Design an enzyme around this catalytic site. Structure first.
Site, PDB file in Angstrom:
ATOM      1  N   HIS A 135      40.748  51.089  40.312  1.00  0.00           N
ATOM      2  CA  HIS A 135      41.839  50.497  39.539  1.00  0.00           C
ATOM      3  C   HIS A 135      41.386  49.279  38.735  1.00  0.00           C
ATOM      4  O   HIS A 135      41.792  49.103  37.584  1.00  0.00           O
ATOM      5  CB  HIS A 135      42.953  50.118  40.520  1.00  0.00           C
ATOM      6  CG  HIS A 135      44.285  49.879  39.892  1.00  0.00           C
ATOM      7  ND1 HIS A 135      45.048  50.893  39.361  1.00  0.00           N
ATOM      8  CD2 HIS A 135      44.992  48.743  39.712  1.00  0.00           C
ATOM      9  CE1 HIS A 135      46.171  50.393  38.881  1.00  0.00           C
ATOM     10  NE2 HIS A 135      46.162  49.089  39.085  1.00  0.00           N
ATOM     11  N   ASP A 191      43.255  41.339  41.320  1.00  0.00           N
ATOM     12  CA  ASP A 191      43.474  42.758  41.584  1.00  0.00           C
ATOM     13  C   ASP A 191      42.534  43.294  42.660  1.00  0.00           C
ATOM     14  O   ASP A 191      42.265  42.602  43.644  1.00  0.00           O
ATOM     15  CB  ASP A 191      43.331  43.545  40.282  1.00  0.00           C
ATOM     16  CG  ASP A 191      43.980  44.898  40.350  1.00  0.00           C
ATOM     17  OD1 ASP A 191      44.192  45.517  39.290  1.00  0.00           O
ATOM     18  OD2 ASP A 191      44.261  45.353  41.473  1.00  0.00           O
ATOM     19  N   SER A 221      50.968  49.324  35.437  1.00  0.00           N
ATOM     20  CA  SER A 221      49.759  48.568  35.752  1.00  0.00           C
ATOM     21  C   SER A 221      48.872  48.413  34.528  1.00  0.00           C
ATOM     22  O   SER A 221      48.128  47.437  34.425  1.00  0.00           O
ATOM     23  CB  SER A 221      49.009  49.224  36.909  1.00  0.00           C
ATOM     24  OG  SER A 221      49.013  50.628  36.796  1.00  0.00           O
TER      25      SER A 221
END
Lengths: 70, 279, 404
Positions: free
Chosen positions: C102, C70, C333
């Site tokens: 994130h 990621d 996600s």
């Protein structure tokens, strides 16, 4: 050969035997028709007592249907 | 809960017999999935067994069983761990002695005055074992067992129980109107018989199997003949069929066993057919 | 659009992570915070569906390596088992700092350790940010997390000209090539669960050549037996637009492949990748936020997110938006993060089963939607305790011979 035609335009075959006749009715004498015309109508399964004696949980779905437009 | 026929040390104090266990009857896949799993019935695994104790005056090596004399009142069993002693229930002390015997048959008897000096500690889980012998049911007289789930409207918890009897828990007069299903699916994930008793539910919503579940994930319709059909959750489908009402809850373990038919939706019905097939 | 095809001869050669061309940072890192009135002493609303207190009886997933491909991860005292894998955005990096907020949210949702009177690693050596008592816990606190930094919004090319190819499409081809490399690298690290939470949307009109990515997926899924789990793709992303559903007039293909308009990759490879859709905390699908493709296979929660803060030492609920506005995260996600935790626990209890069998175990035990198989949600909603205890058949799904 004996055939039954519905108002929807479909044709179904009928067994020649006394059982099949006596059970549906159809005791009267049928009218004559030419195979070159009668074969043009869509065909359904034959009405035989030997195959109506079956059970199901669910039925098979029909492939290639047509749209009903309102 | 799982148990092994080779472990004579546990079978005997509980009241089981190696032959009796080996001659147990089958279990259906359907009921195997419905019952929740509990911890295994095995000999407790006392840690760091056999070493010396940390605290002073310990009556013996770590893992030994201690008891107090009967003349001073009802006997209390205990276990000596590394940093102190923890109490034992009567039924577990018997299992520890039988399994940890290695030839020894009895515990060390110690007086209250010497016992009162030892610090109390709690370092191992022991709530799995019952506190008295098992009343095993003789299966020939009760060949039927069921899992039962129920929830009352307005409640936050469902109730889970097991029932055992000579026959399925239906009234003797109604035993004739149980429906026998066809069975196309041979995977063993579909029932043989279905019964709709008093206060049954037609329109249902799927929920989790645990007793604390609160979701409501999908809507289904259950017919008198036993098959279940799905309903698309849209204002037009609900109102066309007449299902503008609130559905009752049901668990997936029980509901999954009924055969599934085609989906009910306004788009699926707007079709024409010359004649139907028969596969 | 025809389903994907693979040529295993296109595997990219192995090598240390590094970009295809030099890059420089263009923007400052995103700030974070908590929404007004939250109380972290109560459990997150999403944990009620999972029933974790009962699933943990068999264990916490000890000894499992999970790869998080990621935007990287920033260390925190509640993540004592983090490993630096590599960096493809900056040549000097190792994947161990996230400038977009994130990555630490996704990683913490899987493995953050529960509260205690004292932390195992009280030391705090983490570096500064680069410029141009508590109820929260992960799904599987016992796992080992590998971090790899695959993408970021904050970086750009420092020689922007790209020649005969449009600068918009020129970047997609660089992503597809850099994604295949990270999957091969992550497998050689010995990971058993690979989690992908950033994905590309493409027009069905002249899809980009993916030969390298197809072989990379096959190698990791079969020859290395890794479980690959990917998000269905959030509908707020730059190019993702909604796909059509089942059509009753054409029962030819029930998943409707001929009507596809948006392609999501690597999610596209439904034979080797598990794709996760989203549902709210009550169980209804987030119809307006997830792409309903034909490859979707399962679903899990995606709201009321909570996680460890980068750049701090506490929890967070929201991230600082474009304005002064404080924006709350949601979407697929995060749902893919929940399934990565469940997949880790299951293949700790059944270590003899292969990747293709673990996937069938999760699919068969999920609560299904009204149509049996749909596109907004695949076979249904994930169910942890069911996956860990029911007796599932070892073969794939099969239809009955005759119904009469």
């Amino acid at each position: 050969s004996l055939w039954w035609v519905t108002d929807a335009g479909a044709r179904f075959g009928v067994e020649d035997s006394k059982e099949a006749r006596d059970a549906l009715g159809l005791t009267l004498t049928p009218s004559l028709a030419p195979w070159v015309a009668l074969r043009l109508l869509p065909q359904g399964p034959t009405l035989s007592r030997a195959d109506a004696l079956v059970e199901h949980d669910t039925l098979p779905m029909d492939m290639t249907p047509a749209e009903l437009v309102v | 809960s799982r148990i092994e026929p080779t472990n004579r040390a546990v079978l005997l104090p509980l009241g089981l017999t190696p032959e009796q266990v080996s001659q147990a009857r089958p279990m259906s896949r359907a009921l195997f999935d419905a019952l929740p799993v509990g911890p295994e019935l095995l000999v407790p695994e006392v840690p760091n067994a056999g070493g010396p104790a940390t605290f002073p005056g310990a009556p013996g090596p770590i893992g030994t069983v201690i008891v107090t004399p009967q003349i001073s009142g009802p006997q209390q069993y205990s276990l000596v761990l590394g940093d102190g002693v923890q109490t034992l229930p009567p039924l577990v002390a018997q299992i520890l002695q039988n399994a940890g015997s290695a030839g020894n048959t009895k515990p060390l008897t110690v007086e209250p005055s010497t016992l009162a000096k030892m610090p109390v500690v709690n370092r191992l889980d022991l709530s799995a074992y019952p506190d008295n012998p098992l009343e095993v049911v003789d299966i020939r007289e009760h060949p039927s067992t069921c899992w039962w789930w129920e929830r009352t409207a307005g409640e936050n918890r469902a109730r889970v129980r097991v029932v055992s009897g000579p026959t399925i828990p239906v009234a003797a007069t109604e035993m004739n109107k149980v429906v026998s299903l066809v069975k196309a699916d041979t995977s063993g994930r579909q029932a043989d018989q279905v019964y709709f008793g008093p206060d049954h539910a037609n329109f249902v919503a799927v929920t989790g199997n645990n007793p604390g579940a609160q979701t409501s994930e999908s809507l289904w319709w259950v017919t008198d003949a036993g098959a279940r059909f799905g309903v698309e959750d849209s204002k037009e489908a609900r109102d066309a069929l007449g299902l503008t009402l609130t559905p009752s809850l049901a668990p997936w373990v029980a509901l999954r066993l009924l055969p599934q038919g085609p989906t009910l939706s306004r788009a699926d019905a707007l079709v024409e057919h010359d004649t139907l097939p028969m596969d | 659009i025809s389903p994907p095809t693979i040529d295993p001869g296109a595997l990219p050669p192995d090598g240390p992570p590094g970009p295809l061309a030099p890059m420089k940072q263009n923007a400052y890192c995103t700030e974070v915070g908590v929404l007004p009135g939250t109380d972290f002493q109560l459990q997150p609303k999403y944990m009620e569906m999972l029933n974790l207190n009962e699933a943990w009886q068999f264990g916490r997933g000890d000894g499992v390596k999970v790869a998080v491909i990621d935007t990287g991860v920033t260390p925190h005292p509640r993540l004592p088992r983090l490993i630096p894998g590599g960096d493809y955005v900056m040549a000097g990096g190792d994947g161990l700092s996230d400038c977009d907020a994130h990555g630490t949210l996704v990683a913490s949702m899987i493995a953050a350790v529960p509260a205690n009177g004292a932390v195992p690693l009280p030391s705090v050596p983490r570096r500064p940010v680069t410029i141009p008592p508590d109820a929260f816990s992960g799904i599987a606190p016992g796992v080992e997390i590998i971090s790899i930094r695959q993408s970021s919004q904050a970086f750009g090319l420092k020689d922007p000209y790209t020649g005969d190819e449009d600068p918009q499409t020129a970047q997609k081809i660089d992503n597809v090539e850099t994604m295949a490399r990270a999957i091969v690298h992550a497998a050689n690290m010995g990971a058993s669960v690979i989690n992908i939470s950033d994905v590309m949307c493409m027009s069905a009109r002249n899809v980009i050549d993916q030969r390298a990515l197809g072989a990379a997926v096959h190698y990791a899924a079969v020859d290395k037996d890794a479980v690959i789990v990917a998000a269905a793709g959030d509908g707020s992303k730059k190019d993702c637009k909604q796909n059509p559903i089942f059509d009753p007039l054409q029962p030819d293909d029930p998943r409707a492949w001929n009507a596809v308009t948006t392609v999501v990759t690597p999610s596209w490879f439904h034979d080797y990748v598990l794709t996760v859709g989203a549902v709210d905390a009550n169980g209804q699908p987030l119809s307006k936020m997830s792409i309903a493709g034909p490859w979707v296979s399962i679903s899990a929660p995606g709201t009321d997110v909570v996680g460890l803060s980068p750049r701090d030492d506490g929890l967070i609920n929201a991230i600082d938006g474009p304005d002064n506005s404080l924006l709350v995260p949601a979407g697929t996600s995060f749902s893919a993060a929940i399934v990565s935790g469940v997949a880790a626990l299951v293949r700790a209890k059944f270590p003899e089963l292969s990747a293709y069998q673990i996937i069938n175990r999760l699919i068969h035990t999920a609560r299904p939607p009204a149509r049996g198989v749909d596109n907004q949600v695949g076979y249904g909603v994930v169910d942890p305790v069911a996956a860990l205890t029911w007796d599932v058949p070892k073969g794939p799904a099969e239809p009955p011979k005759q119904l009469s």
